[PDB]
């Protein structure tokens, strides 16, 4: 059995045949010389993290203050215009004119628009008027609707006025409390249509305040049958009217009150918790007798907890019963004598039981009474409780006219991830002489204006930062308004099983890897205090395959106007960047000559990053034609750059020649090398090149350099990086592509570190194998692995066929045992935005758990004994010097015919984490400081059952 | 209180209280759709 | 019992599913003689429970006696006749 | 089939339902030689 000395000696001759080849074929030292040879075509500039955040935060504040002025202008006019309405009841003669959307009329006349297609808008829109959306379950032409369609016609002038001042304005919509929504600009509405403006997340937050809701469900015997099905559906539809700022819990009672789920107290009612409550509600049975005294005492006790995090706001109890005889007068006097809790009572089902006590409990406690006799009445009755909650808000006056911003959600008109402003509109008719005050305690509606996140991304440029640097903003709840990992997909819960209304609320600790320091940083941004911190963490790569440890510098400041906090993740070696300063014409024209598509025969195949170089230039998302447009534009235009930035073009043009000089001076000397298949260079400017043009068809990497997985991993590692190919016929990558190597160039201009590009070569697997023979033995096993346990080449003629595959899926016995020796650490994370094929009860959103592996200890000489049971298999492991590779040699599997369960490193569809215990120690959060409830002037003299 | 097994509709010819039971017995006595009431009573105790 | 036993057990579901096509199901032909369910996508096979949930059928002596007693009182005899017209052929059930 | 329908009505099974189904506003089968364009014509008030 070979000793450790001879194995290290054989390894020393192994990496020296790879490092030297990569150091010479790629020309990493030649590119360093080229950058340092000139030192005058560009200039190094400081990248102060503190300056950037205070500047980017101000720009976001100004953008969100331009939108607030548009809401105040709209809300003020609607209150003024509505007060001058007459409420006529005959529209046959003087019909109202409007454009009803979702169409191809007793008292209305339609409008046929022109609908020119527009940029920054996925649909055909018209700015001449405003469209109107009337839900299917509401009949247009009723007296209420037509009256609302007349006085709202004065908003179209204000719609045009706002768009004149700020042409980059998205949908402006007025959500009427009567159901109809009028939005601008007019665009046709997008199966049946179930849209209702009053149930939208942006409407609900402006119609009321956060609430400490609690639901009482009658599960006594008399509710068995149809009326239990209605009760379960009504509870489910009522949970859909709660947001992340509202706290809910569901309890039942049948001769004994108990919780229906695992929570036992109020929870945040986010997307994950509502899914648990809905499952618990949908699994209840009716049995026993009714006791209202016992049920209400339980409800009042959970609203007095105060050990747990709540909203400290509207406290409401909703009773889902059918009928009864007990009034529970003693319970109400004992618990709420001062009417601090509102009680909303529902009479669900078709029955003839006594509704007297149910109606009495409602208005004796500042509540309201609702009837749900059929399925069609569920949706309209579970959303009408926001009129009662909005009574104290209208009595506040101007103190309640504050602009709020929702969570990130997918737009209902196919626009992407957006956020919406919000401002309620009051009914102030007859308020001049102050005598009516009868129906003047209900809001007219809610105004909203959309701010796309792509608009936010334009205010935080990232091209002067390294590919490892980025911006991110955090909501007071903790969710990320802006983040690289945030994707335009709904966040999933559980596992889909079959026999986009919810917001995309991604927590900060879920977007990236969780850490003890990052928890403290997250808390410091929530409570709005600026600061900075540098520290060392381990960073997941672009793909879920590798983890590398690096240094980062988190700088955060709060946005003054809003409640958001903006942070900048600027790594080391990124505080300085190259600023191109070229002014001479012929020295700029020659650089552009290399980008001609017909010049690839001597400069190599060339890609260019589809950045927003100039406004009239348009991206094509394929780069087959984008390169044609780019180089036929710069010549077909004056070099003064009249309407587009020279900074983003001077970088790409200067880097065009810096890589160009490498090809002829060093790469062209070696036309072909024995062990090298392709040579590539990727540059911060946004260009990549491949010298062998016939091998340029195998470049599947994204043209945008900032999104390249290998680029970001190479900057962090001081040594060379080996990237394993994909498996299971994931395109051509097995033998015709090769093994990728990378090494980021490092330059020192004036003692400052810069990493402007990465260079590498594709190692030929066929020639690499010949370095082991210089084979297929049944006595000993030899494999090579990278940082992450992926096979790169072997000597068994079956291992090499399964190339680029995780070691745990081909030899779990040694792989599982290796982790115990602490050679390979690992971290498990959940991906809340991922689609997977549903299991037995298309694709649906689901949570997938990802794991990655990395080197744990810095020591290289590893040895041990693998005891699979009733036998043994000695092994020795050596890590290649100055390379992320590890060489491990073990006795062949023929001696020990054992095979444990394979250790899979892939996206495992999991339902975790369990939320029954996250509520016990919830993440820190800060609630809204506004609270509009319990106004003494509130009327609440209408029970709701007196008129029903 | 045993005809609550459909969960999709409410039956009118039941035995929930005395007037309704009396009406149901009268209807069976006249022989009009007594088979429907018999089927409901059979399903109320399991099934076929 | 002798003439027709277990023949009202074949309605038309959808394509490779356990969900019946129409909300008022009626049996198909037993051997290509009775009603044929011809819709957009519909093939009919066994496994159905029965017309009245399994209460009205002739696949047992108790079931046959109950069905005969129901028919002898002139209450719902046409329903059974039509169900047998759908399931079995068209010429025998009217005589019975 | 007409005689069977009359026997069913004599038994009194759903005779009023057929009577309602025989009112004028009924669709005609696409086999009678009716005037093109109009097909909801067969049926008469004689049914009652
Ligand atoms: C803002 O608040 C003002 C008041 O503060 C409110 O204006 C009031 O509107 C109502 C109609 O909704 C007017 O009522 C008048 O008198 C009776 C009673 O409502 C109506 O007669 C019937 O009323 C029932 C009520 O449900 C209705 O269903 C029915 O269709 C009516 N007609 C019948 C049965 O034939 C009158 O029709 C109605 N109008 C008249 C007499 O012209 C109040 O008089 C209005 N108050 C004031 C001071 O003008 C206004 O709607 C609120 N804003 C919004 C957007 O709702
Ligand atoms: C609610 O509906 C009402 C019925 O149409 C509207 O009231 C009508 O508005 C018309 C448009 O201005 C008026 O016509 C002209 O109005 C101007 C303004 O003072 C004047 O030139 C004349 O009064 C009039 N010209 C004529 C009649 O030749 C109607 O007079 C007016 N009243 C009616 C038709 O009874 C309301 O405007 C509408 N509410 C809103 C907010 O638009
Ligand atoms: C938000 O506003 C606060 C105060 O209004 C700003 O705080 C300033 O902080 C600097 C140093 O950090 C001080 O020199 C100033 O005197 C402070 N301002 C005031 C008015 O005292 C903060 O900079 C603002 N943030 C942004 C992003 O604009
Ligand atoms: C938290 O709620 C508990 C009951 O749910 C309150 O009662 C106390 O519970 C803790 C836990 O053992 C102990 O202090 C005593 O057993 C209880 N009484 C007192 C007077 O503490 C408790 O008061 C609530 N608040 C806190 C801070 O525990
Ligand atoms: C991610 O992986 C790291 C590295 O394996 C783990 O953190 C280690 O935790 C143990 C105790 O639980 C400590 O002894 C180690 O020092 C930690 N490693 C460090 C700090 O590098 C853990 O599995 C994950 N880290 C988390 C969840 O924070
Ligand atoms: C909009 O915001 C910008 C800053 O982002 C500000 O300069 C401008 O005055 C605002 N208003 C308009 C109409 O552009
Ligand atoms: Ca009861
Ligand atoms: Ca009858």
From Swiss-Prot, chain A:
**Any S-S bridges, and between which cysteines?**
363-931
The residue numbers the entry assigns to motif MIDAS-like motif are 218-222
The UniProt entry lists the main location of this chain as membrane
Keyword match Disulfide bond: yes
Where does the VWFA domain start and stop, copy by copy?
212-389
What is the reported tissue distribution? Isoform 1 is expressed in skeletal muscle. Isoform 2 is expressed in the central nervous system. Isoform 2, isoform 4 and isoform 5 are expressed in neuroblastoma cells. Isoform 3, isoform 4 and isoform 5 are expressed in the aorta.
- Molecular function terms from GO: metal ion binding; voltage-gated calcium channel activity
Name the gene. CACNA2D1
Extracellular domain ranges by topology:
1-945
Concerning SMART domains, the annotation shows: VWA
GO cellular component terms attached to this protein's record: extracellular exosome; GABA-ergic synapse; L-type voltage-gated calcium channel complex; neuronal dense core vesicle; plasma membrane; presynaptic active zone membrane; sarcoplasmic reticulum; voltage-gated calcium channel complex
Protein's name in the database: Voltage-dependent calcium channel subunit alpha-2/delta-1
InterPro entries tied to this protein: Ca_channel_alpha-2/delta, VDCC_a2/dsu, VWA_N, VWF_A, vWFA_dom_sf
Swiss-Prot record, chain B:
Compartments where located = Membrane
Q: Where does Ca(2+) bind?
A: 32
Tissue specificity annotation: Expressed in pancreatic islets and in brain, where it has been seen in cerebral cortex, hippocampus, basal ganglia, habenula and thalamus. Expressed in the small cell lung carcinoma cell line SCC-9. No expression in skeletal muscle.
Q: Which residues lie on this side of the membrane: Extracellular?
A: 1-48
Q: Which domain of life, per UniProt?
A: Eukaryota
Stated role: Voltage-sensitive calcium channels (VSCC) mediate the entry of calcium ions into excitable cells and are also involved in a variety of calcium-dependent processes, including muscle contraction, hormone or neurotransmitter release, gene expression, cell motility, cell division and cell death. The isoform alpha-1D gives rise to L-type calcium currents. Long-lasting (L-type) calcium channels belong to the 'high-voltage activated' (HVA) group. They are blocked by dihydropyridines (DHP), phenylalkylamines, and by benzothiazepines.
Family that this chain belongs to: Belongs to the calcium channel alpha-1 subunit (TC 1.A.1.11) family. CACNA1D subfamily.
Domain comment, in the record's words? Each of the four internal repeats contains five hydrophobic transmembrane segments (S1, S2, S3, S5, S6) and one positively charged transmembrane segment (S4). S4 segments probably represent the voltage-sensor and are characterized by a series of positively charged amino acids at every third position.
The illness linked here is:
Sinoatrial node dysfunction and deafness: A disease characterized by congenital severe to profound deafness without vestibular dysfunction, associated with episodic syncope due to intermittent pronounced bradycardia.
Q: What is this protein called?
A: Voltage-dependent L-type calcium channel subunit alpha-1D
Protein species of origin = Homo sapiens
Q: Which part of the complete protein is shown?
A: 674 to 721 of 2161
Swiss-Prot record, chain C:
What name goes with this protein? Voltage-dependent L-type calcium channel subunit alpha-1D
Q: Which residues lie on this side of the membrane: Extracellular?
A: 5-92
State the organism named in the record: Homo sapiens (Human)
Where Ca(2+) binds, per the record, is at: 75
Free-text comment on this protein's domains from its UniProt entry: Each of the four internal repeats contains five hydrophobic transmembrane segments (S1, S2, S3, S5, S6) and one positively charged transmembrane segment (S4). S4 segments probably represent the voltage-sensor and are characterized by a series of positively charged amino acids at every third position.
Assembly and partners are described as:
Voltage-dependent calcium channels are multisubunit complexes, consisting of alpha-1, alpha-2, beta and delta subunits in a 1:1:1:1 ratio. The channel activity is directed by the pore-forming and voltage-sensitive alpha-1 subunit. In many cases, this subunit is sufficient to generate voltage-sensitive calcium channel activity. The auxiliary subunits beta and alpha-2/delta linked by a disulfide bridge regulate the channel activity. Channel activity is further modulated, depending on the presence of specific delta subunit isoforms.
What is the covered span of the full protein? Answer: 290 to 385 of 2161
Q: Subcellular localization, per the record?
A: Membrane
Tissue expression, as annotated, is: Expressed in pancreatic islets and in brain, where it has been seen in cerebral cortex, hippocampus, basal ganglia, habenula and thalamus. Expressed in the small cell lung carcinoma cell line SCC-9. No expression in skeletal muscle.
Q: Where does the UniProt entry place glycosylation sites? A: 40
Q: State the family named in the UniProt similarity comment for this chain.
A: Belongs to the calcium channel alpha-1 subunit (TC 1.A.1.11) family. CACNA1D subfamily.
């Amino acid at each position: 059995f070979p000793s450790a000395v001879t194995i290290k000696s054989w390894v020393d001759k192994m990496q020296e045949d790879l490092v030297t080849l990569a150091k010479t074929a790629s020309g990493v030292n030649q590119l360093v010389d080229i950058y340092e040879k000139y030192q005058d075509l560009y200039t190094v500039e400081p990248n102060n993290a503190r300056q950037l955040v205070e500047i980017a935060a101000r720009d976001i504040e100004k953008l969100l203050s331009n939108r607030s002025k548009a809401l105040v202008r709209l809300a003020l006019e609607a209150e003024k215009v509505q007060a001058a309405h007459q409420w006529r009841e005959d529209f046959a003669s003087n019909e109202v004119v409007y454009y009803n959307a979702k169409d191809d009329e007793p008292g209305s006349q339609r409008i046929k628009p022109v609908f020119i297609e527009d940029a920054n808008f996925g649909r055909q829109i018209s700015y001449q008027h405003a469209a109107v959306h009337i839900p299917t379950d509401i009949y247009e032409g009723s007296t209420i609707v037509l009256n609302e369609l007349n006085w709202t016609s004065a908003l179209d002038e204000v719609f045009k006025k706002n768009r004149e001042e700020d042409p980059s304005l998205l949908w402006q919509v007025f959500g009427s409390a009567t159901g109809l929504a009028r939005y601008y600009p007019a665009s046709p509405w997008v199966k049946i249509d179930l849209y209702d403006v009053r149930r939208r997340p942006w409407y609900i937050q402006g119609a009321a305040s956060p609430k400490d809701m609690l639901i009482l469900v009658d599960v006594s015997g008399s509710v068995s049958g149809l009326t239990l099905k209605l009760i379960r559906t009504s509870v489910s539809e009522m949970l859909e009217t709660l947001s992340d700022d509202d706290f809910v819990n569901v309890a039942s009672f049948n001769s004994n009150a108990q919780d229906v789920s695992c929570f036992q107290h109020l929870v945040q009612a986010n997307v994950r918790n509502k899914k648990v409550l809905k499952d618990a509600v949908n699994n209840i049975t009716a049995k026993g007798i009714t006791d209202y005294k016992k049920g209400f005492s339980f409800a009042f006790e959970q609203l007095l907890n105060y050990n747990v995090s709540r909203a400290n706001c509207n406290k409401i109890i909703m009773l889902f019963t059918d009928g009864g005889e007990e009034r529970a007068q003693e319970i109400f006097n004992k618990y709420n004598k001062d009417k601090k809790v509102r009680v909303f009572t529902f009479s669900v089902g078709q029955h003839n039981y006594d509704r007297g006590p149910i109606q009495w409990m409602a208005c004796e406690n500042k509540g309201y009474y609702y009837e749900i006799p059929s399925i069609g009445a569920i949706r309209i009755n579970t959303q009408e409780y926001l009129d009662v909650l909005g009574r104290p808000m209208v009595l506040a006056g101007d103190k309640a006219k504050q602009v709020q911003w929702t969570n990130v959600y997918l737009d209902a008109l196919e626009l992407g991830l957006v956020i919406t402003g919000t401002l309620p509109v009051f009914n102030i008719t007859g308020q001049f002489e102050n005598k009516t005050n009868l129906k003047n305690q209900l809001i007219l509606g809610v105004m909203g204006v959309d701010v796309s996140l792509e608009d936010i991304k334009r205010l935080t440029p990232r091209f002067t930062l390294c590919p490892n640097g980025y911006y991110f903003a955090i909501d007071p709840n903790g969710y990320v308004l802006l983040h690289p990992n945030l994707q335009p997909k709904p966040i999933g819960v559980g596992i889909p099983t079959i026999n986009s209304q919810e917001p995309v609320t991604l927590d900060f600790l879920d977007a990236e890897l969780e850490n003890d320091i990052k928890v403290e940083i997250r808390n410091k941004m929530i409570d709005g205090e600026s600061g900075e911190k540098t520290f060392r963490t381990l960073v997941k790569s672009q793909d879920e395959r590798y983890i590398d440890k690096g240094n980062r510098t988190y700088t955060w400041t709060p946005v003054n106007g809003t409640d958001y906090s903006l942070a900048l993740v600027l790594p080391t070696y990124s505080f300085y960047y190259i600023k191109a300063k070229l002014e001479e014409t012929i020295t700029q024209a020659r650089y552009s000559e290399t980008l001609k598509p017909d010049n690839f025969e001597e400069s190599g195949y060339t890609f260019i990053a589809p950045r927003d170089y100039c406004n009239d230039l348009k991206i094509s998302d394929n780069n087959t034609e984008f390169l044609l447009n780019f180089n036929e534009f710069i010549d077909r235009k004056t070099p003064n750059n009249p309407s587009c930035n020279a900074d983003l073009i001077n970088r790409v043009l200067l880097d065009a020649g810096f890589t160009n000089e490498l090809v002829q001076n060093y790469w062209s000397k070696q036309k072909n090398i024995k062990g090298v298949k392709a040579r590539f260079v990727v540059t911060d400017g946004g260009i990549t090149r491949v010298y062998p043009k016939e091998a340029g068809e195998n470049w599947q990497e994204n043209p945008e350099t900032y999104e390249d997985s290998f680029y970001k991993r190479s900057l962090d590692n001081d040594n060379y990086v080996f990237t394993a190919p994909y498996f299971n016929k994931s395109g051509p990558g097995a033998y015709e592509s090769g093994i990728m190597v990378s090494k980021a160039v490092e330059i020192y201009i004036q003692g400052k570190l810069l990493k402007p590009a990465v260079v590498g070569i594709k190692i030929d697997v066929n020639s690499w194998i010949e370095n082991f023979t210089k084979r297929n033995s049944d006595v000993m096993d030899c494999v090579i692995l990278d940082d992450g346990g992926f096979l790169l080449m072997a000597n068994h003629d079956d291992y090499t066929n399964q190339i680029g595959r995780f070691f745990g899926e081909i030899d779990p016995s040694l792989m599982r045992h290796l982790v115990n020796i602490s050679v390979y650490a690992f971290n498990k994370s959940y991906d809340y935005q991922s689609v997977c094929e549903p299991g037995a009860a298309s694709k649906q959103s689901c949570i997938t758990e990802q794991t990655q592996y990395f080197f744990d200890n810095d020591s290289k000489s590893f040895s041990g004994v693998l005891d699979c049971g009733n036998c043994s298999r000695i092994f020795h492991g050596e890590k290649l010097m100055n390379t992320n590779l590890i060489f491990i040699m073990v006795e062949s599997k023929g001696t020990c015919p054992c095979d444990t369960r394979l250790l899979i490193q892939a996206e495992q569809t999991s339902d975790g984490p369990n939320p029954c215990d996250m509520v016990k120690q919830p993440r820190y959060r800060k609630g809204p400081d506004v609270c509009f409830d319990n106004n003494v002037l509130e009327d609440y003299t209408d029970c709701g059952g007196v008129s029903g | 209180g045993k005809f609550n097994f459909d969960e999709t509709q409410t039956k009118r010819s039941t035995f929930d209280n005395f007037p309704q039971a009396l009406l149901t017995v009268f209807q069976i006595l006249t022989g009009e759709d007594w088979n429907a009431v018999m089927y409901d009573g059979i399903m109320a105790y399991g099934g076929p | 019992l002798e003439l027709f036993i277990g023949k009202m057990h074949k309605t038309c579901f959808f394509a490779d599913s356990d969900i019946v096509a129409e909300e008022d199901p009626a049996p198909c032909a037993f051997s290509g003689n009775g009603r044929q369910c011809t819709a957009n996508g519909t093939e009919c096979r066994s496994g159905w429970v029965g017309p009245n949930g399994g209460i009205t059928n002739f696949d047992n002596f108790a079931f046959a006696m109950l069905t005969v007693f129901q028919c002898i009182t002139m209450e719902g005899w046409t329903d059974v006749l039509y169900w047998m017209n759908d399931a079995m052929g068209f010429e025998l059930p009217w005589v019975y | 089939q007409a005689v069977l329908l009359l026997f069913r009505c004599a038994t009194g099974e759903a005779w009023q339902e057929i009577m309602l189904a025989c009112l004028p506003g009924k669709l005609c089968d696409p086999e009678s030689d009716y005037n093109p364009g109009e097909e909801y014509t067969c049926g008469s008030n004689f049914a009652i």
